[PDB]
Ligand binder design. Sequence first.
Ligand code: 2W2
Ligand code: NA
Ligand code: NA
Ligand code: NA
Ligand code: NA
Length: 259
Amino acid sequence: DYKSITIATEGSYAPYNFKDAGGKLIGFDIDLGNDLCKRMNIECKFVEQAWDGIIPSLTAGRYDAIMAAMGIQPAREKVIAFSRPYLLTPMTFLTTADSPLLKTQVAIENLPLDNITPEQKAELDKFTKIFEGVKFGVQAGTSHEAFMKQMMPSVQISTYDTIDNVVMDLKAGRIDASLASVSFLKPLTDKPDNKDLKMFGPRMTGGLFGKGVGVGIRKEDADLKALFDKAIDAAIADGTVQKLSQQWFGYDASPKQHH
Ligand SMILES: N=C(N)NCCC[C@H](N[C@H](CCC(=O)O)C(=O)O)C(=O)O
Ligand code: NA
Ligand code: NA
Ligand code: NA
Ligand code: NA
């Protein structure tokens, strides 16, 4: 049943995991991680780890789990295991409030990508054509990068160490647009600080975006995955995930029972 675990997080992806005024790690991932460990009867310790290297540091045994807004993504499933999802959110585009990209008609509001029908492909092709000549920025090593490189290869993309640097460059006009989850973009654009930023386009799920946010765990740690899965099911069931989601995101992005 374990006694103590070390959970890695990035600390540059608000409101999932970031730093407070005193430099302490805070956010939905921290609050949920602490709640889950309390249910598992395990001592919880959060450590900071750069996004670039967070998966090989887990497999190298530098810590026991990852809670860092990490999507349960098929490429990642080849390397590590995941808990069942603790948050579910679609992906959408981001630009500035004065951008002509905002006027683009969205033919498909909710776009599931596990299977891409010709109709869905025509919508993706439309946005690809509109974005040719638009400078995109994404955080390196994300499903956002994977989507742009696989689904929109003709679009110029710049990759960044952190999403904070993406946002800085979008505000400065060094890039024209970005891509991230609604769970990241809604709290970002809700801030009065970011009235100059707007979400737009289809809300996409599945495909290379994966099956929701999960706890990253080594494949051989089957018992640790079982403990997390039981704790997450209980935290969803009693409304804890919904409560924390409302607190950090300003809305309910918690998953539903029976999957
Ligand atoms: N900088 C970080 N600590 N994490 C970046 C994670 C970005 C992305 N996941 C987050 C969380 C939502 C999800 O994957 O279902 C997002 O899309 O906003 C991903 O797994 O590459
Ligand atoms: Na990754
Ligand atoms: Na919204
Ligand atoms: Na409370
Ligand atoms: Na808030």
